[PDB]
């Protein structure tokens, strides 16, 4: 039961205090047992805004990609927490990072229909021309939703 494993579990469990204690005692900020998942992915998974900045402060890699190609930014888009996508963008998150289906975070937010996250991704330079692997761009996921909301913010 080492520090890495304990840090992953505290991040996973959303125990911010235990994350801070473990980091102070030397735990590896990019620890990943299982699936390329780092503490930053896990804390993003949970929506835990404050602790995200402590981990970046400890030099956490904001663009760490897990074994599905999902970066913390992909995850923040999936979860649809505006506050979290904003902070990850501030800290150098790759807005055009591609997973293994070829999605970028903009692709993931368009699926979930999280609208005021798509604005933010676009201003941070999120190329909408982006095609996934089976071709079907973010436009082709506006139509899956039948949305005169997402399409009508897309010229």
């Amino acid at each position: 039961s080492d520090l890495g494993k304990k840090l992953l579990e505290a991040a996973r469990a959303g125990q911010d205090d235990e994350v801070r204690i473990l980091m102070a005692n030397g735990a590896d900020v990019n620890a990943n047992d299982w699936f390329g998942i780092t503490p930053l992915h896990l804390v993003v998974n949970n929506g835990h805004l404050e602790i995200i900045e402590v981990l970046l402060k400890y030099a956490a890699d904001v663009n760490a990609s897990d074994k599905s190609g999902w970066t913390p930014l992909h995850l923040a888009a999936y979860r649809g927490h505006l506050e979290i996508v904003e902070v990850l963008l501030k800290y150098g998150a790759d807005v055009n990072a591609m997973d293994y289906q070829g999605y970028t975070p903009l692709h993931l937010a368009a699926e979930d229909g999280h609208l005021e996250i798509v604005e933010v991704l676009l201003k941070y330079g999120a190329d909408v021309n982006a095609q996934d692997k089976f071709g079907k761009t973010a436009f082709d996921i506006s139509i899956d939703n039948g949305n005169e909301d997402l399409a009508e913010i897309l010229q």
Binding site: A13, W34, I37, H41, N45, Y78
Partner: protein
């Protein structure tokens, strides 16, 4: 030219007729060795499974630790040969439940066999048990088994709160394919690689799931817990099913 079995072990089983197990579903190769006076079983796993709950060496260690504690096969010989782990063992006493009982159309007996398993496990002192199973060990291993896809459900699972654990002896794959019965009682347990210390709700959750998809009625589940003398914790049971459902 190169064999996956040592020349010494081949010598030893020469006079048995090998009959590969066509049922079984794990990465292990299993052969029944049919002899004149008895049958043995040979179970073998390749190198990439080393250090996992699928390594037959772990199975072998657990079989040895469980002697006197649970009815299990005897370990006759174990070796490593060219990355492979080979275990030769005795035939379990009795009749594999799933064959000659689950088709005897008496669903109360299945439930009771499972309750009887859980009871047996709860009575075993695990103070010096050589292996322990955790969420982390389970995840790591899943990582490795997939060393050479859609993440949404993984992250949904990881966001879920994990119940505090109460450690008991855990089979880890409790199911009538690994349980043997004889004149009423449990007579044998096989497939022990995933066994060790673990949260008690792990085996119980497996039992609930199996009652649910192979018998299909809530009062049977409610009977299961009457037999156990405990109340269900559906949160704990749900948790471990989800865990095991990450494919």
């Amino acid at each position: 030219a190169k064999m996956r079995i040592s020349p010494e072990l081949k010598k030893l089983i020469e006079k048995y007729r090998s009959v590969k197990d066509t049922e079984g579903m794990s990465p292990a190769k299993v052969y029944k060795l049919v002899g004149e006076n008895e049958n043995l079983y040979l179970k073998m796993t390749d190198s990439r499974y080393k250090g996992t709950t699928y390594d037959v060496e772990r199975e072998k260690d657990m079989m040895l630790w469980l002697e006197g504690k649970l009815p299990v096969p005897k370990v006759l010989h174990f070796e490593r040969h060219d990355g492979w782990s080979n275990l030769l063992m005795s035939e379990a006493d009795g009749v594999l439940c799933s064959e000659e009982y689950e088709d005897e159309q008496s669903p109360e007996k299945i439930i009771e066999l499972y309750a009887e398993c859980i009871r047996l496990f709860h009575s075993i002192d695990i103070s010096d048990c050589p292996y322990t199973n955790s969420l982390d060990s389970r995840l790591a291993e899943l990582d490795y088994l997939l060393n050479n896809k859609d993440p949404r459900e993984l992250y949904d699972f990881l966001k879920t709160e994990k119940p505090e654990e109460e450690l008991v002896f855990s089979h880890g794959d409790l199911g009538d394919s690994n349980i043997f019965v004889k004149d009423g009682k449990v007579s044998g347990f096989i497939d022990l690689g995933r066994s060790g210390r673990a949260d008690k709700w792990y085996d119980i959750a497996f039992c609930v799931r199996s009652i649910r998809e192979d018998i299909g009625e809530e009062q049977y589940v409610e009977l299961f817990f009457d037999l156990l003398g405990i109340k269900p914790d559906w949160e704990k049971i749900k948790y471990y099913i989800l865990l095991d459902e990450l494919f």
